[PDB]
Each structure stands twice: as C-alpha cells, then as structure tokens.
Amino acid sequence: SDVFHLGLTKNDLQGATLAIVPGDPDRVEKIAALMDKPVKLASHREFTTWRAELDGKPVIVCSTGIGGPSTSIAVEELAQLGIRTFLRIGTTGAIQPHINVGDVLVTTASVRLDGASLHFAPLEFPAVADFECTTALVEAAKSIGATTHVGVTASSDTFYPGQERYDTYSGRVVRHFKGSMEEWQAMGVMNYEMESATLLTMCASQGLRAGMVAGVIVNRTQMKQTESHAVKIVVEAARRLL
Amino acid sequence: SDVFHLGLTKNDLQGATLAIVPGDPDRVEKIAALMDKPVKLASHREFTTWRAELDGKPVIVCSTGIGGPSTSIAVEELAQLGIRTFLRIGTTGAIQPHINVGDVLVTTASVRLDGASLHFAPLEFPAVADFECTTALVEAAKSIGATTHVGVTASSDTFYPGQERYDTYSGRVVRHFKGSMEEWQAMGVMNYEMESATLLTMCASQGLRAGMVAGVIVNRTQQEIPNAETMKQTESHAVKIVVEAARRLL
Amino acid sequence: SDVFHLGLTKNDLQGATLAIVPGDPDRVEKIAALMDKPVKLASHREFTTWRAELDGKPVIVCSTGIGGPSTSIAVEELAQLGIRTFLRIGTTGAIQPHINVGDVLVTTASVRLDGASLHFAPLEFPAVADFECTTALVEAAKSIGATTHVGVTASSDTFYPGQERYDTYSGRVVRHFKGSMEEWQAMGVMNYEMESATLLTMCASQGLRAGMVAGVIVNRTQMKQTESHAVKIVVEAARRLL
Amino acid sequence: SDVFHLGLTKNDLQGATLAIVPGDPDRVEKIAALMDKPVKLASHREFTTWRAELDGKPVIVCSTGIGGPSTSIAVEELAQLGIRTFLRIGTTGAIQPHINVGDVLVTTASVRLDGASLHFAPLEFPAVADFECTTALVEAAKSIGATTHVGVTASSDTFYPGQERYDTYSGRVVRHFKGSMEEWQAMGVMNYEMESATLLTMCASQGLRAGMVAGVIVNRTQQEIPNAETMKQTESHAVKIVVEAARRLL
Amino acid sequence: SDVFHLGLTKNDLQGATLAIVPGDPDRVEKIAALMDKPVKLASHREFTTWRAELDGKPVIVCSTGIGGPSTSIAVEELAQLGIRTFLRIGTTGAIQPHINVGDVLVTTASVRLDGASLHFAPLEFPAVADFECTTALVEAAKSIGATTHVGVTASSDTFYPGQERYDTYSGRVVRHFKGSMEEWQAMGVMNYEMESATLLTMCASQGLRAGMVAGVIVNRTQMKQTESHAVKIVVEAARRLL
Amino acid sequence: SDVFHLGLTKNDLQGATLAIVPGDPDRVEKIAALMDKPVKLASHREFTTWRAELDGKPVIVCSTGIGGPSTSIAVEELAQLGIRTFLRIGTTGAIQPHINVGDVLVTTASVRLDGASLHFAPLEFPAVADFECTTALVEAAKSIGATTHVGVTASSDTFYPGQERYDTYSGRVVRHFKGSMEEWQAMGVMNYEMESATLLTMCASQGLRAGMVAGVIVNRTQQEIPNAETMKQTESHAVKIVVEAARRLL
Ligand SMILES: O=c1[nH]c(=O)n([C@@H]2O[C@H](CO)[C@@H](O)[C@H]2O)cc1F
Ligand SMILES: O=c1[nH]c(=O)n([C@@H]2O[C@H](CO)[C@@H](O)[C@H]2O)cc1F
Ligand SMILES: O=c1[nH]c(=O)n([C@@H]2O[C@H](CO)[C@@H](O)[C@H]2O)cc1F
Ligand SMILES: O=c1[nH]c(=O)n([C@@H]2O[C@H](CO)[C@@H](O)[C@H]2O)cc1F
Ligand SMILES: O=c1[nH]c(=O)n([C@@H]2O[C@H](CO)[C@@H](O)[C@H]2O)cc1F
Ligand SMILES: O=c1[nH]c(=O)n([C@@H]2O[C@H](CO)[C@@H](O)[C@H]2O)cc1F
Ligand SMILES: [K+]
Ligand SMILES: [K+]
Numbered sequence A, C, E: 001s002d003v004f005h006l007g008l009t010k011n012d013l014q015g016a017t018l019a020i021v022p023g024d025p026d027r028v029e030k031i032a033a034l035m036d037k038p039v040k041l042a043s044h045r046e047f048t049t050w051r052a053e054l055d056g057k058p059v060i061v062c063s064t065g066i067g068g069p070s071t072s073i074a075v076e077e078l079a080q081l082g083i084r085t086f087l088r089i090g091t092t093g094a095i096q097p098h099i100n101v102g103d104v105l106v107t108t109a110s111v112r113l114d115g116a117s118l119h120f121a122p123l124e125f126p127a128v129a130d131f132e133c134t135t136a137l138v139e140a141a142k143s144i145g146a147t148t149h150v151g152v153t154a155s156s157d158t159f160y161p162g163q164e165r166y167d168t169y170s171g172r173v174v175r176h177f178k179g180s181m182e183e184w185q186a187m188g189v190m191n192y193e194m195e196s197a198t199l200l201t202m203c204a205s206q207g208l209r210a211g212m213v214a215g216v217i218v219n220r221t222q223m224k225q226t227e228s229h230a231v232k233i234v235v236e237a238a239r240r241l242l
Numbered sequence B, D, F: 001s002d003v004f005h006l007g008l009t010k011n012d013l014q015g016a017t018l019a020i021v022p023g024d025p026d027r028v029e030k031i032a033a034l035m036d037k038p039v040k041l042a043s044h045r046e047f048t049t050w051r052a053e054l055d056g057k058p059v060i061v062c063s064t065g066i067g068g069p070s071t072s073i074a075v076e077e078l079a080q081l082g083i084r085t086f087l088r089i090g091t092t093g094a095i096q097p098h099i100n101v102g103d104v105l106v107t108t109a110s111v112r113l114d115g116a117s118l119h120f121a122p123l124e125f126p127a128v129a130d131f132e133c134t135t136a137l138v139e140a141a142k143s144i145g146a147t148t149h150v151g152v153t154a155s156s157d158t159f160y161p162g163q164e165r166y167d168t169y170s171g172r173v174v175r176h177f178k179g180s181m182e183e184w185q186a187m188g189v190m191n192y193e194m195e196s197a198t199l200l201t202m203c204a205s206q207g208l209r210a211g212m213v214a215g216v217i218v219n220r221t222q223q224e225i226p227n228a229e230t231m232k233q234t235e236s237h238a239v240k241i242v243v244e245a246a247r248r249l250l
C-alpha cells in the first residue's frame, strides 16, 4: 500500500483521476455496480474502495465514513494516488418546507460547521463546489428528470446538537447552536449533512475539483429508492466530467 | 423618493427586477448605453442610477461605490424597489501567473475579507454566487470569445493592506494580513476586488440572485506598465459580457 | 495624478497637511466655501476634492464616500500626499434619549463594527481619536454655543442590520446584531455612523491625527441647518489645529 | 434498532453501562476476545459492536470510526442505550523525544483541534478526562508494567495538516497550523490522535465518565521504520490495559 | 531580591521546590503555621511569602492576590527561584445543588474565563491540573474525611458579571455572560473561583505541576472552619508530593 | 462593611464621589498624605483604603492590586459606595525611543490585552478614557512642568509573556504574543501596564468617568540600570499630577 489508510497502490487505480466518494461503505459496491468491470480493491476501517469503468475510463469509488476527519484522510490519500476530481453522493435532511423527501440536492457552497475545513483554509474562505462538477450534477439530475434543488448546505461535525436535534440523551443544545436551524432556514440553506464543508474547502483550496449531491431522506420541517436516483445522477455526472 | 439614499421611486423602475451594479458611478451610463432607451434616473452620493431596455424588458444600472458598506445600501434599497437579481461588473487585480490583464474573471464564491457580509450571515456562511447568474456569465463570456477564468475571489475591505500592498504611507501591513496574498495564491484564489463578499453573502442569505464578473486591469505577480487603452478596452468587454448575461437572466 | 484614485498631485495641495473629510461628495464644496480662495481640484468615483485657505494656510476637503473601505483609500492616498491631520464631519443617528436632533456629537473613540479597521490593527486596539483634534472640536463647538455631547460612537459597516433596523426588505437582523442597539445604549454609546471606526483606527495606528464630529439628523429612540453648524465647527477646529 | 446508526436495541446491552470504544472496527473483536462470552451484536457503517462479560458484568465494545463526528454519534447513541462510562483505546503519534514507540499514553485532557467538541461546549471548556477513569487506566498500566506517560494530548480533526504533516499532495500546511507541532511540543503535549477532544468534552459536559489511553505506533521526532510486529504488539498491551481499567471501573 | 515583585532571593527558599499559593495574603501565615519552623520572608504588594518545613523539607507559601494577572507574576517569579510544584488553596462559590457550603472541591480542569491563560497557550489548550497533584489532593481530603467533589471549575477574571451576579452597581451583565451560569450548571461545572484557569494553564504548558483545591463558602443555587480544613488538606497533599 | 471585599461602609466615604486608585497598596498613604486630614479606613487583601480632603471635599484613595480582576472588584465596590470618578496612577514600561524614564504618560485609550474588560463589553468596544479626566490630567501635568506624552497604552493581563519578556523561567512566548511588542511600537503605542484596559472599559461602559496616568520607570527599547531614587522621584511627580487632576475634577 502506497498510502497509510486506504491500503491502495497507485497501480490499483490504473490511471483513474476521478472518484465518487459516498459516506457509507455499504454504498460503494452499489455505485460501482452501475459501471463496467467493477472490482473491489480494498477495505480498511471505514474506507472501502472499488474500481470500475465508465466509457472506457477507470473510475474509483471510495467511502469516506461519517465526518470531515475521515473524509480528509480519504481525499488526501486518493489525491496522493492521482485523483483530481471528487464527487460526493450522500444522504441529507432538508430544512425547507418546499423540499420533499426523495428530492435531490446539489450544493453550490457550504456553511462550515466543521473543524477539518479549518485545517486547510481559514473560516473566511468559502466551502464552494467546483463550477464544472456542479454543472455536471445539475445536468445529470435533469437528464433523468429528478426534482432538483440547487443552493447552500449546512455541513455539521455532529448529527445531533450541530443540527439542533433535542431528541437526545441530554435533550440540550449548547448555546452557540441553540436556535441555529431557524437561522439557517431564514438564510435559505436547503439541508444538513456532514462532509461537504470539509470536502469542498480542502478541494477548492488545493486545486482539486469537487461536486456534492445528496438525496433527501427526511425533512426537519415536516428511502432506498432515493439513494438509487442520487447514485445514478452522480455516475452520470462523472461521465460528463471524464 | 421611496428609499433613503438612492432617490428613486418604485415607479422609476417600471417593473424592473434585475440590476447591473458597477462600483464606479462613471460606468453606469456606459453600461446603459449598450441597451435601449437609456435614461438617467438619479445621482446622489456615490449612487448613480440609469434605466434602460433589454429585449423589451426594463433594466436598472446602479453604482455601488467602493466597498461593502455602500454596496449593501444600494442592494438593500434596490431590493426594496423590486430588484431580485444583481449582476456586478467590476475591475480587479489578478494574483495568479496564468491570468493576464484583459482577461475576464467570474467569481463562484468569495473569501470574506470584509465586514458588511458579517452583518447578514456569520463568517461560516459562504459568499457564494447564484448558480444561474454564474452560468449566464460564463456562457456570455464564451459567446464573445473572451479569455475567461472561473473561481474564488478574495474580496477586501481595503485596497492596500488587505491586498497586502506595501507601496503605502506607512509601508507596513498589520500581522493578520502579512504574507496573506501568498496564502491566497497557494489556495488558487484568482483575484482581489472589494465588493463581491458583501454582495454575494447578503444576496445568497436573503433569497436574492447575484452574479459577479470583473476585468483584469493589473496582475500582482507581473510587475506593471498599465495601459489606459487596454484597460478601457477590458472594461468594454466585461460590460458587454454582463449585459449579455442579464439578457439570458431576463 | 500621483495616486491611484483621488486624481491629485502633491503640488495640488500646495503644502497642505490637514484635510476635512466629509462622507458625502456634495458637502465638499459647502465646507470649502467657508474658507478662502476655494477651488475644486478633482472628482472621481465618490472622491471629490477641493482646496481652500484658512488663516493663510492651504487646507484640503475630500469626500470619503460611505463606509470604511472608501474611507481608507481616501485617507491613505491623502497621507501619501502629505496630509497628517484628518477631521471627519458626518451625519448621525442618536440612540440616547437625552440627545436631540440638531445636537453635535464629538467621538472620543468608536465601537468597531467595521471590517477595514481590522486591516490596520487587531480588534483589541482602540479606535480612539487624537486628543488634540478632539479638544479642538470640543472648543470649536463651544465657541458657537452648540449643544454638544462627547463620548463613544458605534461605527457600522451597514446602514441597516448593523444598526439593527428592521424596516427592510428581509425585515430580519442576523443573530450577532439582534438586540445589539439596546446593548450599546446601556453602555452609553451616543450614536451610529459608518466611517469613524476605520478612520480613527487607521490613523491612531499610523501616526496620523484624527478627529470626528457629526450632527444628529435623527434619534432612534424617538437637517440642513444641523449640517451647517457641524461644518462651521469642523472648520473652526481645523483653524485651531493649523 | 432503538438508535439511528448503531443498529442496537436496549436489550442487546443486557444492562451494560460501560463501553470500550476503539477507533478501528477491526479492533472491536480483539478487545471483546479478552473477555468472557464475546458476541457480535451489529455492524453498520464504521460502527461495529460486540458484547462480552467482565467479572460477570456485561460490557460493550463499539468502534467510533476516525474523527469526532462519527465518535459523537456512537457515544450519543450508546448513552441513549444506557452506557455511562466510556474508555477509548487508540493508536497515536508521539511528539516528545523521551517517549518511545510501544509506550502507553494516558490523556488527562486534550487540546481541542476538532470541531465536534464545540457542538457540546464552547472552546474555553476543558476537554478533561474523568478522574476515576484516568486513575483506573494509570493503575491498570502499572499492573502489567507498561512504560506509561500521563499528560496532555493534541486531538486533531485531520491526520495531515492538523498534525503538521507535509508529506502530502499539496505539501503545504495552512497558516494557523504552520509551526504548530513545535508549539505543542514546547507546551509538553505528548501526542497527536483524532478522537479524544470530542470524546472527553462531550462526556465531561454531559455527566458521562470517560477515559483515554493510546499506544505509540510512531514518534514524530524520531524518523521512522515502523514494525507491524511491534506495532501489533503495542496494540495488544493497550487493549489489555483498557480491559483491566474497565474491570476496576465496574 | 532576585525577582522583580516577590522581594525574594534564591537562598531564601533553601532549596524549596514546592509552594502552596493561596489568594489572600492573610492566609499565608495560617498555612505556614501548620508546618515546622515557619518564618516570614517578605511582603510586597499583594505578595506575602513565608517559609516552613514539612517532613524536613523546606516549603514555600506565597499569596497570589486575586486574579490571573497577579497569579502569573507570583508563579513565574517563584519558578525563577526553583519552585516546580504549585498547590492552590482558595475559597469558592458552588453552583450545583448537591454541593454544600463547607465541602471541599478539587479541580481537574478549568473553564478559561480569564485573559492570562491566553498569554501562555491558545484557548483550545486545556487548563488541566497535574495528575499527581490532583491525586494527592483527593487522598489528602479523604485522609481527614472531608466531603469532597472532584470536577470542572469555571475560573473568572471578574467576581461579578463573569460569575453572572446582578446585585451590582449597574445591575446588568454583558451579553456574552448573560445566562452563562445556567449553561455551566448544565455542563456539570462545580464552582466559580478566580485563579485556577491561569494557574493550571501556565503550569501545564510550561512543565510545572499544579493542583487546585477550594472550600465552599457559598452556594449560588441556595466559613473560617471551612478554610481550616482546606488548608490542612493542601498541606497534607504537599506532604505526599514532596 | 457594606461591600464584600473593601470592608468599607457608605458612611466611611462621607459623601466622596472621586477616588484615586493606585495599583500598589503601599502607595495609598503616600497619595493621601498630599491632601488634608488623611485617615486610613481599611486594609483587606490587596485593598488598602484611605480618606482625605481636597479643597474641602472628601476624596478616596484605594489600591486595586495588580491586574484587571482585582481592579474590577475595587472599582465595582467603590461605585456601590458612591464613587463616580476614578483616576488611576501607576508605573509603566515605555516601548518608544523618544520616551524617557521619569516621563509621565496619559492614556487616551488602551489596547485590550486583558480578560476582565470583556466581562463588561465585547472586544470591539473601546477602552477609552473620559475626556474630562484626560483633560484634567494633561493640564495638571503641564501645571508642574512634567515631560508628558499622551496616547495609546497596551494593558496586559501578564507582566511577562503579554509584554513579550523572554527573561523568564520558560524563556518562551506563546505564538499570539510573539513579535507583539514590535507591532505595538509600529502602531505608536507608548507603553505597557496592567490595569487600564479593565478600568477604562468597565467605566466607559457603565457611566463612570475614568482617567489614567503613569510614570515611566523603565524603557524597553533602552536597556537598563534602574535607579530607586529616580524611580521613587518619578512616582512622586505622577502622584502630584493625579492629585492636581482630581482637584480640577471636584
Ligand atoms: O439529517 C441528516 N443529517 C446528516 O448529517 N445526514 C448525512 O448522513 C450521515 C448521517 O447518518 C452523515 O454522513 C451526513 O452526511 C443525513 C440526514 F438525513
Ligand atoms: O488591484 C485591484 N484591487 C481592487 O480591489 N480593484 C477593484 O477596483 C476598485 C478599487 O480601485 C475596488 O472597487 C475593487 O473592486 C481593482 C484592482 F486592480
Ligand atoms: O442613522 C444614521 N446612520 C448612519 O450611518 N449615518 C451616517 O450617514 C451615512 C448614511 O447615509 C453614513 O456615511 C453614516 O456615516 C447617519 C444616520 F443618521
Ligand atoms: O500519527 C498518528 N496520528 C493519529 O492521529 N493517529 C490515530 O490513529 C488514527 C489515524 O490513523 C486516528 O484515529 C488517530 O486517533 C495515529 C498516529 F500514529
Ligand atoms: O463566589 C465566589 N467567587 C470567587 O471568585 N471566589 C474566590 O475568592 C476570591 C473572591 O473574593 C477570588 O480570589 C476567587 O478565587 C470565592 C467565591 F465564594
Ligand atoms: O514594564 C512594566 N510593565 C508593567 O506592567 N508595569 C506596571 O506595574 C505593575 C507590575 O510591576 C503592573 O501593575 C503594571 O501596571 C510597570 C513596568 F515598568
Ligand atoms: K468516520
Ligand atoms: K463608498
């Protein structure tokens, strides 16, 4: 292995330069299955990697695990191996009334509620997605007729307090985040997820292209099939980025 | 006047919902001149407004003056008057070697080195441009064949220390900004300008669409010898691009 | 032109070392008119400059435009041309009950609600006015018998949310500034304006003397003539500073 | 499942109130194997859970995955299930010369270089370990004669820049973290790891007891030449120490 | 004098390496009196120093005065003189219902509501006590059967607003600290005092061992004898640390 | 006692509304001695209080001890007792070449390097002195012909690292303060002391008038060789100046 965590060698990628990075290890195979000659490369910790062909071009699929920390490791090590483009496919919770479960969301930029993005650029730097990847994702979504929403996403280091959930053990939310969801709502933020801030920031500040798309599995103001459409959309986007 | 600073009435706009907002008052007429039936509406402080027609649709052109403060006033008051889409056309200094004077830059999002954006959203919120406006700007730039670059822009509250210029009275830059340009360069930031952070943040957090395009009049990594001609010509292309973008946004 | 924005040459100032800097371009001529041999020097963007004589000494009057950004450019470029003393005359909104419209306010120091001051000194540095300029302004105000108030001023980068105005398009104020006016009131702050923080900080941290005086055109807790008195006061102060 | 991610039910724990939480899923079974009647309960995402008996008391072992985010989920959901005591056993990089690979480190408190801890308490709150858990860990380490060091640990959201590693794709470290390792060294910080800040803070601020122990697999001040054997042996001792500590905490 | 403030010479300490540092000058003699051959060494400003013997080992007792500023001076200068271990004995206000006046509190780490700790380490660094000193204090407390509580302490630069007291001249608390006590309570913080944050941080970040124990003289949610027990406990702890 | 720390009763002040507040308890009597009918009122912790008459008006003199924490207690409790005006007289270290030992410095505002001021107003609020008190101090200094300097002062919570002193036990200064003195120097800051930030902020934000004057006992830019005599003489003039200022403020 040429990297510390992924257990992958440069040759394993066979010249691949684009990677689809879902958060859940169990989704890696599903994504690879939509492409040609899918093969499992490695599985260590929360990092599962598969290789496949798209239009005769080798493509990588690697899980990041939940959170910016594990995400930064995967992205960094994949970059060390030649990957220059990253497309994240995730699951998300909508916080706007007009957005419905099943809808697909494309992130233009993210509210940085994480700590890892700060290890690449100060807070004033935008966690913005690459224009080409965003475009590809939008078109891909349109190509299959999925109800899509494009905009800002709140990327949190926590699933609970950071997303102002009170149905918890403590049933309490620290002051900084109390009343925070309502604030994001009034600002037009579409959803909550946990890896885009780190992904977009570290990529945008290091010459790497990144895109972000997620399927709505829940709406805070009010599933397997939704994941399916989002997966197709990201593979279709990758195709347009090759 | 229905607003405190612009000296404009709702009726003046004749139903206009899009405005092109240059920083310099003197550029307002130039921009309006590329459209039909251009008419001056008002002039107060650094706020000069003109109205014109584009494809049979009334369009506004209003100068913001330099900086997020004056920019936030103009945008806020124009919004009070019905404007929902804002396209900024400015001048900028490139900080990357591969970018040349005369090139056109489209901002996807901005590094917030201003104070006004913070009056609309905390620092963690991205100063991102509207996807539709950015797309229109990109296509418009392509439509006339201008050498274009798309990416991140550093928007500063100051022309000098914030952009780490030392050719100043004090010849000194406060610690926070010392060595800052090099940091931005390593991060891929394309340029320095002074209104996008405020514009994009206040719009993105209030349901308003905004786009940002600027012409390169200088490159910080490549010494000098400016050319009023070339410079005036660069402004020309950027103006044409923003008007073309507006057309696609109407 | 020896500077990038002002369109002025060192010789234009004829040895002037003090400048009165109003925010509104249209007020420049009014101020110059109270002095001798007033002459317009230039007009570019929001920067209008006039020269005049006061007690046989050349004095500059230059508009800064609204906000610290344009203010820092004007001050910096004027300094490059020899100006060492700056007196700002502005308009302001009082936030204390005992202060009335028409009253004149002299700022001793400012609450930094701007971004430009930070480009000269970290937030912990005080946006304090020069003792000599403050003194001159106080005496000048007294010399004409104007009802005067001396104290702290809140200098905001925005006219609306930063000054907690809700009569706006969004009718909303970001969390950081919600309930902020009341806080300033309890702290004795006298008013809101938009250039003193940047002016005083950049001057106080660069060996430049600065003073700040403004006329109250509105009281948040409850016009042409007020501007008139403030203008006289600043010209009278300049006279004592020459 | 009574929780959203762990896929566990209250009944699965059989009254367990203490959990050993390693970062790597693959270590869960190893830890459970040192106890009695070890049984796998679930495996979802980076969360692998096993149950076992220690002195006739049911004990849980659950992987957190790398980082405070996944750690906070696991801890929160385990707490929802009754766990009140958490003992983390990890791997770490030493940054002090006197500390050797193979040594065991017990964290009294951590430098918060993460983002998740901030979602439980402001930065001024200390990421301190529970006194009882720390004591148990210290005694346990002593009971087997392991070379131990007790002190402060720097817990980072990143493996690379946050730990000031330059052997990377960009080969660059953002300003805030440039020269940071040397600063931590001068302050006596013993090591770098990636979950203690979040673990200790969220537990210390919510009435939950937590302890932290890690085996040194590398020393940043002493070049390299890792040894899978030694490394695998270090993990072994750390595991034994944490299980022994749990025993004293039951 | 070999130091600027304490008025002490290296020889005065006769090889002492541990010091008990109370906040009140008047408590120095009381503490020294429990040991052998107590002798007053100096008295300057709020810094009173005494020397004594404990198990044949010279020990120092020096008052820090109230607050991190004076505390940092005393600790720094004592360190310059050879002291490597510091045990603070103070008075404190409990903020938890289950803690009673008279109880003894041992601080494991502190919430940094001070400014001095920041002059030694950034805010993210923990104001944690030395494990050995904490252990000694716990055992010492047990040795005399004192009702003890071990945990986190909020160390404030102010006695009033920082501890959210409203019975003041202004009867007002700045926004940052409004509702702060309740927050600390929900987080399990045991008490409020004014020197531990600075003490623990500066020591923990400079290779110096420090411990912190205080007697509860008041409970915010609901005296000479309490001080007595705390003094014994700290002397007993020092004995175990020699 | 009507207050928790000062051990003073409202009656003790006999209607006094102004207090001179030195940092050192030992200076309280010296200051009181220049006035009429000086009497010691109390002595507790670092708080020593004396009362005296100035032009037939009762005046208080109370030591604050070193630092904003003890300073805030004294000021708060004195205010509870009726004091509305505070004049601080201290000792200071100059950081500018043109300032000499023995010179007197009047602070117009302070750089807030303390923590206590933040307990009264956020960092953006200026630690500015009262205009009337500053004026009185300036005139008083002039009245005796002392070489005076008026300007900004850096008020630090620490005597050593915060004032970037390396002649210490650790011989190290935390990153935030490394190279800080030079920055303050370039900004024109005249000196370092340890109570003005807290004093001016808490007073300026609570309707209390405050002034600040200090005598230079050392200049950081000009090596050393202190003189107890000169030093004791500098304190003398500063004391005379503050008493004279109080007289003009009564
Ligand atoms: O409400 C949600 N919050 C959230 O963070 N997610 C995403 O799905 C995972 C949480 O289970 C995280 O990786 C995150 O990216 C989904 C959601 F539905
Ligand atoms: O180097 C530059 N920096 C800069 O900020 N600008 C832009 O032009 C104006 C300053 O001249 C500002 O409004 C800003 O948007 C142009 C430049 F060429
Ligand atoms: O309420 C007010 N707020 C305010 O900012 N001002 C000042 O006048 C201009 C706003 O029109 C700004 O330049 C500012 O300095 C006046 C006011 F009356
Ligand atoms: O140098 C190291 N840095 C580090 O963070 N670790 C730990 O091991 C994992 C990364 O490999 C993280 O969970 C972390 O806790 C180990 C190391 F050897
Ligand atoms: O409520 C309290 N708050 C407090 O800060 N203290 C402590 O006792 C002194 C206050 O009088 C300070 O030195 C501090 O350490 C005691 C208390 F009882
Ligand atoms: O260099 C100096 N630094 C300093 O802080 N002081 C002042 O004198 C005391 C420290 O000796 C503090 O109260 C402070 O106000 C004097 C000095 F000479
Ligand atoms: K993870
Ligand atoms: K302007």
Ligand SMILES: [K+]
Pocket (backbone or CB within 6 Å): E046, E064, E065, E066, E067, E070, F046, F064, F065, F066, F067, F070
């Ligand atoms: K003190």
